[PDB]
Write a protein that binds this ligand. Sequence first.
Ligand code: MG
Ligand code: ZN
Ligand code: ZN
Ligand code: ZN
Lengths: 114, 559, 168, 49, 85, 196, 159, 141, 133, 43, 263, 65
Amino acid sequence: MNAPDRFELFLLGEGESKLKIDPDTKAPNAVVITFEKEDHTLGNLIRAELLNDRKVLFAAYKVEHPFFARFKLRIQTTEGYDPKDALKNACNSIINKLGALKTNFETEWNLQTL
Amino acid sequence: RGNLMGKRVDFSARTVISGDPNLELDQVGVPKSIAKTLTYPEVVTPYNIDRLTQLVRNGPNEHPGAKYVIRDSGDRIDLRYSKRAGDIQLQYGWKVERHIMDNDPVLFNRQPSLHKMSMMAHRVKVIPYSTFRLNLSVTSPYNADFDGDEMNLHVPQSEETRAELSQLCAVPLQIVSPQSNKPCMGIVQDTLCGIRKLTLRDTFIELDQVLNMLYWVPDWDGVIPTPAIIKPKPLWSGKQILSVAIPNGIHLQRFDEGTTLLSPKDNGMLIIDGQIIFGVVEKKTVGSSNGGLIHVVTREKGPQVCAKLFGNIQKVVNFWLLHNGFSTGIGDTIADGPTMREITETIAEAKKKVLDVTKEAQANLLTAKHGMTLRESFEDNVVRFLNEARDKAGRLAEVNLKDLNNVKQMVMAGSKGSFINIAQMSACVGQQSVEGKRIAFGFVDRTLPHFSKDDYSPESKGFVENSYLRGLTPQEFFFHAMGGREGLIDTAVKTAETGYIQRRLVKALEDIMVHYDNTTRNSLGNVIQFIYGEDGMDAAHIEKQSLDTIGGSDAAFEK
Amino acid sequence: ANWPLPVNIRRIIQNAQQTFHIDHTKPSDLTIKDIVLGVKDLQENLLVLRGKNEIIQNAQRDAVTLFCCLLRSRLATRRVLQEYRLTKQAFDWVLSNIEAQFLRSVVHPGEMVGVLAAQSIGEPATQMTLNTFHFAGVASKKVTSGVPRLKEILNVAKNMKTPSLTVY
Amino acid sequence: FDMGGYFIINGSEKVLIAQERSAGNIVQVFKKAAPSPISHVAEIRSALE
Amino acid sequence: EKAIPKDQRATTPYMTKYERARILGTRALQISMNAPVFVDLEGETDPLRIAMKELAEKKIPLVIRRYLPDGSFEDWSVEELIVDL
Amino acid sequence: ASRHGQKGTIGITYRREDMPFTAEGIVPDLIINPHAIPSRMTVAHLIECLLSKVAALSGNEGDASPFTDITVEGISKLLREHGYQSRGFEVMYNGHTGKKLMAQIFFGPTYYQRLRHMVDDKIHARARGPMQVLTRQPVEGRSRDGGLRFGEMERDCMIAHGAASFLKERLMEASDAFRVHICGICGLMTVIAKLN
Amino acid sequence: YDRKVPSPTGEYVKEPEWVLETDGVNLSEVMTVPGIDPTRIYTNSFIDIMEVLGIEAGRAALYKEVYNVIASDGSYVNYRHMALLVDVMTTQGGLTSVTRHGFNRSNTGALMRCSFEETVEILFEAGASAELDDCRGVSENVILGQMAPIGTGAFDVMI
Amino acid sequence: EGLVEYIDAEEEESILIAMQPEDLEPAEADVDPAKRIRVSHHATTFTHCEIHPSMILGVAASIIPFPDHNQSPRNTYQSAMGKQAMGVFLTNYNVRMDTMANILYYPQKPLGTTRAMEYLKFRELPAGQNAIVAIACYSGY
Amino acid sequence: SNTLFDDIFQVSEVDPGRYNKVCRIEAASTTQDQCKLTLDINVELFPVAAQDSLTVTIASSLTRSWRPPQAGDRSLADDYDYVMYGTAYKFEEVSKDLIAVYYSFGGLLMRLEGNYRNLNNLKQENAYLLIRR
Amino acid sequence: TLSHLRRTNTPIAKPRQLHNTHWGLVCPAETPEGQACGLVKNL
Amino acid sequence: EEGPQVKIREASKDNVDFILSNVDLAMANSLRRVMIAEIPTLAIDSVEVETNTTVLADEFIAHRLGLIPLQSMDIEQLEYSRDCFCEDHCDKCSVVLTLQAFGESESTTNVYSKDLVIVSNLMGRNIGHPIIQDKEGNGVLICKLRKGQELKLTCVAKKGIAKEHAKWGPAAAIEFEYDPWNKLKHTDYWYEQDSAKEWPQSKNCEYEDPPNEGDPFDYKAQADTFYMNVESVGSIPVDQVVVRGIDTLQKKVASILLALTQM
Amino acid sequence: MIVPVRCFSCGKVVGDKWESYLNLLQEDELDEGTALSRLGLKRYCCRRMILTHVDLIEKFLRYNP
DNA sequence: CGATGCTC
RNA sequence: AGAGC
Ligand SMILES: [Mg+2]
Ligand SMILES: [Zn+2]
Ligand SMILES: [Zn+2]
Ligand SMILES: [Zn+2]
C-alpha cells in the first residue's frame, strides 16, 4: 500500500541527478558527493579504491537509510589535489582492474573442458 | 466517562509500530498515506503563499500537497473534486488544509497511557511503508515493543496548540523524568550489547572503519583524532571513536568493585572533556541510570543536545556491530562436562539434606522454634535447601560461562537476561510453587497418581531438578505448568487491579497544582502543602548527592 | 548521606576545574575571608519564596536548610583549598553558577502536581510482579505486600490481612 | 480431512461448547468463616438424573 | 480592584514555562494571521520561530495576569520577566 | 511467529545481496534478534533449529516429540558428521562489504508461522468524517472511518503536561463543540434560536 | 535486626538488636509494657498509629507503608509524589480513603465528583441541596469544553 | 481382551500408574549426562501404566517441538497463536463460500515433528514454512 | 619537547586478565630502585615476555586533524618499535617525595611512580609513549 | 478447528488454577490469556 | 595480463569454481553483489488469462510463470520497455509466449515450461526459449489438470534485473570464502574446548599454507585471494554470468565517470 | 499445491525436480537424502524445498469439476 | 457500588 | 459477544 516501486532503486526520477557535489563546511579541500539510485556495490568499491591514493586524506561512505538507494561519499585530499580528480582516478583505476579481470577469466575459461 | 472526560476525535491516526535505528529520538516515521490523510489548517500570509500555492497545485494525491482550501466565507473547496481544483489562485486570510509535513509537531501515544511520557510530541518524518517508525530509545516511556503493538497519532490544529506540544510535550524535554528524578530513556538492545563489545580494551579498529564510523556522526568536526597506537600500524581503540559521539565539557566518574584509577578490570567510568579515560560502557553508564552519561548530558548541554546524543551513539555502535555481528545458539546454554558433574552432585547433597530433615521429623526428634508448627518449620527448611541447591548449581554454571558466551555477554552488557535465566536454562529449573507453597496433594495424600501416598520428597512436591537444556520429566512438566498457570492468573488480575488503582489516584489528585505563592492547593483553594514536596523544587531538577558532614569518624571529620 | 537534592555541586566544581585550567602545583589567590564570607553570602541569596515578611522569611529559611547543609560541607575552606585547589576566578564562577542553577531547579507555578503524583505511583504499581513476596520462604516473614497491600492502604481497610506490631 | 462434530444452522457451522458443572448427589463438608455461628456445614445438591 | 500594585508584587520575577508556551503560541497565532512583526526578520517565515525572536529581543507587547488563590492578581509584562530556563 | 511463543513483525526487508551469507552461499529468509532468547528461556527454539538443520541435511524428519531420549549432544554428533560445527554456528560474511563477521551466527531452518491481522488490515487515519447521531461525536471503526479514542487516561497526560489549549482543542475543534443560547436570568437552554 | 549505630569514634557501625514481630495489634497496651522502647514501637496498621499517636504520626506511618510497597518491588518513586498522596488522605484530620467513600464525599465540585463513581446519584443530591459549582475544577472545564486553570490556563494573557 | 481400561479422576485416586512401560518396571543391579534425570521406582505396586505421557497435552500444545525444553507460559502463549496461523484449513476451500479464508501458497510440513502430529493431520495440512533463520544483530532493524 | 622522560625498565610480570590482544605489564627501572611502571601493551603487535629490558620514552611532539603516515619523506621521533598517544588524568603524591602520573592510551592505562617527573610531566591532553627493543 | 471442537467452558474456590486431577484429562498448557484464563479449557 | 588473476578449479554448464587472486575484497564483493542483483535477463512480466478452470488461482499461476527461466543469451539486443518508443510492448522490447493446455485424458495432465510457445518475432536472436535442464526434457511443472480442466493465457516476457524482482536473477548461489586459516584474524571462533577441533576444516585449506604455531600476528596483511563458485539458473551460461557481472560493474563505474563530465 | 518453481532462499530451479524425486523414491527404491543429493540439491535450503513440500494439488484434483 | 486500556 | 498487545 505504501510500498515504493522497485524501479525507484535503480531509476532516477525527474529532477534527481546522479551525482550531487556539495563542498564540505567543516574541513578544507573536502567535498560530499550524493550518489542517487546506487548502493553498497558502488559505495564500498569506490571508497576502498580512494584509500589506495596517497594524496587522499579522508574517504568514507554511508547509506543514511535503507529505504532509499542514495549514498553519501566524503573525500578530503591534499592541497593542490581536487577531490573530484581523486574520484575520477579511483573510477578509472577500477575500470582498468575490471578490464584485466574480464580478459583473465576469458583466457582461463577457454582453456577449460566441460 | 465515554463522552465528556474522553471521546472519539478527528486528526487522529493508528498503526503497527516499527523500530528505526536511522530515526532521531524526537522523530516519528509517518506512512505517506497517513500524511496524505491528516491535514493542518495554514493561513495564507506573504511568508507562506508561494509554498501553499504549490501544495494546492500538488493536490490530495501527491504528498507535499493539500485537500480543501477555505475562503473568507468559511466554504471548503474540495481539491479532490472541484472543476476549479487546478485553477485556484490564493488570497491572504484564506486557510489551506495542507498535508502533514516533515518537522510538524504531532502527539504520539501508546495505550495504556499511565504516564505523562506515554504521550509525547514528535517531529514528523514522512516515510514509505505502512508502519509508524520510532527511535528505539523512546520505547521505554511508551512501554512499547514491535511484536504487533499499535500507536496513536494526534495532529494539533491551532498555532498555539502546536506551540504547547513543541515547548512542553516534546520528547527531548521528557528525557529526565520527575517520577524517579532520573532519565526515563537510555541506550537499549543492540546498541547496549554492542557498546560493551565496542568499548573493550581488546577492541581496536583500523583507519578504513574508523573514517566510516567518524563520518556516521553527523555533528562530527571533521578532525581525525590521533590513534591510541602509532606502532606497526595506526590502531584506534573502541572508547576513542565512541568519545566522538560524546560532547565536549562532559565529566563523569563512578567506581564499581575493584575500580582504582588504574582500573585493572576495566570497571567503573571516567570521562573527561567528553573523552572516555577508562571503564567499559554498559547499562550503569549508558542506560536510563540515575547518575549516568544521559542524566549528566541533559543537565550540562541541554535536552536538544542530549536527544542528539542518542542518535550519535546509536549510529556508531549499530554500524560497528553490523560489521562485527552478534548471535546466540544452543551452544551458549551448554555447560562443561566437569561443571555438570558438580551441578548434578550439588542437587544430590540437597536431596540428602532434605531426606535427613525428613527422617529427623519422622523420628519426632525435630523441634520447631516458637511461633511455628513442626511441619511449618520442616517445609521452611526443605524449601531453603531446595532453593540453595538451584542457586548453587546456577552459580556453578555462570562461573563456567566463558567471556565469549553470548548469554553471558548479554547479561554483562545489561541488554538482556539475569542469573536465573542462566541457572534455569543450563543448570537446574528448581522448585515450583502454587500459593507460595510447594505442589499440594490434589489427589488424596499425593500430588500425582504415579506417586505413593504421604510422599514429601522434592521430586514428589514439584522440584524441577532438570534444566531446560536437559529437558523436564512428565511430573516436572505438569508441576512447572501449575506454577506457570498461577503466574498467568496473577498477570490478568494485577493488570486489572492496578488499572482501577491508577484511575482512583488520578481522580483523587486531578486538581492539585502549584499556585503563584509556591503553595500546593486544590479547586477549593485548600492547602495540601505550603511548599511543594517540602522544598518547592521540581523533581526533574533533583539528584542523589552525598552530604559529607553526616558520615565518617570524628577524627576523619576533623581532618 | 546520599539524598536527592537540586544543583550537582560536584559537577560545578569539575566544570570550573576544566574551564579555568586548575593546576595542583601553583598556590591559590583566595582568602579565608573570600571563602568563608563568600559561601555565607551565597546562602543569604538562595530563593524559593521572595517575600520580605517573617512567616515567608522563615518558610524560605526552612526549604534551603538541607541544601545549605550540603553547600557548607562541600564549600569549606580546607576542601576549597586542599581538595579543589580553586582560584578567586573559579570560586566566584562556582558561586554564581549554584545561584542560577538553584533558581532553575524551583518548581513552576502551574505544574499539575496532583496528576503527576498519581501517575508517578500508578505506573510503577502496574509494573509490580507477583502478590507472592520474596519473604514466602520463612513463616515468620509472611506480611501482605504488592498490589493486595497497596489496595488495603488506599481503601483504608479497617480489617487488614497481616496486622503486625514491631517491638524494639 | 473434515472431522464432523458440529452442526449447520442456517448455513453456519456451530460448535456446542462443553459445559463444566459441579456434579450432583455428592456429599461435601465445608468449614465456615470466623464470625459465622455455624462451625461446619454438610451439603448435598440432590438432582434427578 | 481587586488587583495588586506594581510595588509589593511578591510573585516570581522569572517567566514560567507555561507562561512562555502560551506567550509564544498567542504571538505565533497573531503572526500567522498577518499581524505586524516588531523584529527584523532574517529569512524567518515560521510564526513560532519569529515569536521566539520577538521574545529573545523582548518586543512582545503582552502582559501576564497572575491570579493568586484569594482571587487577587499581579500584572507582569513579557518585557520585565526573566527568560532564563 | 516461531512455534515457541515468539511473536514478531517485519521491521524491514533486505534483498539477497545486502543479507549476510554462508561461505556455501546460503542466506537467511529471516533474521531474529539474539535478545529475544535469554529472558524468554525458549531453549526448544534453539533445539528445533539444530534438529531441523540435521533433518534438512539427512533427508529425514526430526523427532521433536516431548518425553523422548533425544539429546542436544545426539543432534550435535550427527550435525558434525554432516561437516558443520555441532552447535549450529556458522561463519557469515557481511553482505555490504564481503568481510567475515567477527562473531559466528546460529544459522539453520526453523518452522515459522504467517499470522492473521496485517498492517494494511489495521492502518487507520481520520482528519474529520462521519459523526454519530446522538452524541454528534466521531464514529467507531476503521471500516466506517471512525475517530480514535482520546480517553480520560489520555486527558490525564495532557493535564500533567499542563497543555490546557491542546486539551480544549481535542474536546472541541476535533470531535464535539456546539453553540447554544443561554438565558441571563434562569440560565437554561430555553432560549429560542431565531437566527437572522 | 541490623542497625546502623554511631560508634564511640564517630563512624556508623552495624550493631544487631533483638526485635519482636507480632501477629495481631494492640498498640496502646503494648507500648506501656516495661522493657520495650515506646519511642521506637511500630505497626503496619497506620489507623492504629493514627488513633494512638495522632494524625501527624498517622501521615508518617502512612507514607512509610506506601514507600514499602514501591520499595519491595525494587521500584523507586521520588518522595514528593507519595508525600502529596499521603498529605491528601491526611488534611481532613483523619484517614480519607481513595475510594467513592473517601474523596468523592468531599466539599469539591458537583460535576467534578460525578466524573468518578456514583455518577447519577452524585448529581441527584447536587440538585437536592441546589449546589453551586465553582467551575474551578479540571473535570468541570473538561465537561464545559473550556481552557481549564491548568498550567497554560492558570494565568490570563492581555495586551 | 482387557489389556487397556478407561479411568476417570475418581478411580485415578485408587490406582498406581507407571509412566513408561519398560523404564518403570523391569529389574535392578555408567549413564549419559546429556539425558535428563529420572527418579527410578520406589513405588512398585502398579495397577496401570500410562499409554504415553505426551498424551497429557491437547491439539494446540501437541504442535510444539520439545515443550519439555520450554518455560511453561511460552507453551501457553504458543497454543493461543497457533489458531492465528494460516495454512490449509480444508482441501475444499475453493468450494466453500465463507466469511474470511486465509490460504498459504506453499505450505510446508515442519522438519521438526511430534509423534502426536500424525493423528492431528499436520503434515498433510500444514500451517507454516521451514524458513532458513539466522539469530543475529544485523542492521538493528 | 623533544623528550620529557626516559629510562630502561625490567619486566616483572605480564598478565592477560581475560584479554587476548592486551597484557598489563609490571616493571621497575634498572637505574632508580624507587621508580616503577604499570602499563597495558598490545601484545598482538608488540609481544613482551617476562624479565625483558625495554626503553620507555615519554615525549610531547613527534595536533590538528591526523594525516596518514605517507612514507613520501615523512620522519618523526620514531627509532622505536612501539608508539602510543594518550592523555594525563591524575597526578597523586605517594608520600612526601614519591609521586605518580596517570595516562590513558585510548583506555590502555599507564602509571609511572618516582620523583624526578618534576618540570616535565604536566597536565596535558598531549603525551606520546615510545618503546624500543 | 480440531481445537475448537475439544473446548470446555466453566461459568461463574480456585477454578482458574491447574489442578493435579487435570492430569491426562485437560491440557496443562492450552488456556486463553486473561479473563477466560483457567475457565476455558481443552481436552 | 596486468591486475587481478583468475584460476578455474571446476567448470561445467551450471557451475564455475575459481580462485580470484590479486583483488581487493571490496571488488570481489561488489562483483558477488552485481552477479546476484544487476545482470539483465528475460522473464515473464505480464500474464493475460483467457481461461482458468484449474484448481490454482490466476495470480498463483502468473507468479510461477515469472519464475520459469527463459533464454537470456542475446538479452543486450532487446530493449527495456521503459526505453522503447512503442505503445506498451513490441518485438524491440519483449517476447510473447502462449500457454494453451486442456486435460483430455481421464488421468492427470501436467503443464510444463516446454509447453510455452513463442508467438513474438524473435528477429534471429537467442531469447525467450524456456530453459530445459530436465532429463525428460519437460522442465518446470507449471501446473496439473483434471479430466476436463483448461488453461489458456498469454505471457509478455521482459528485460529486467533481480534488484526489481528476484525472478530476473541469472545466478543461484555464489560460494564465497577468503583466508581459510583465519590468519587475518577476521573472525573470532566460538568454542567450548578447542576451536581447531570444534570447527570443520574448509576445502580451501589445501590451496593455502597453515599459519605455523610459532609465528607472530601479521598485522599489515589484507585479503587478496578469494575462493568462489558461481551457479547459473540457466538463462545465461556460467562464464557469461561472471563476464556480464564484470561488465555491468564496469558500466556503472563508467556511468559515474561520465556524470562528472555532465557537470 | 505444486513444487515451488525455484528455492525461496537461493533461487536454484526446483520446479523441474518433483516427478524425478518421486520416481527416485518409488521406482529406484532410494531414500530421501540420497534422492535429493542425486538431483544435485547440495545446500540445505534446496533440500527443505522438496523434502518439506506437501503436494495438496493431488487432493484438489480429486474434486469432481 | 466498583471491576485495566485498546480494537472488527 | 469474538479477538490483539
Ligand atoms: Mg507488545
Ligand atoms: Zn429564562
Ligand atoms: Zn517496444
Ligand atoms: Zn537453495
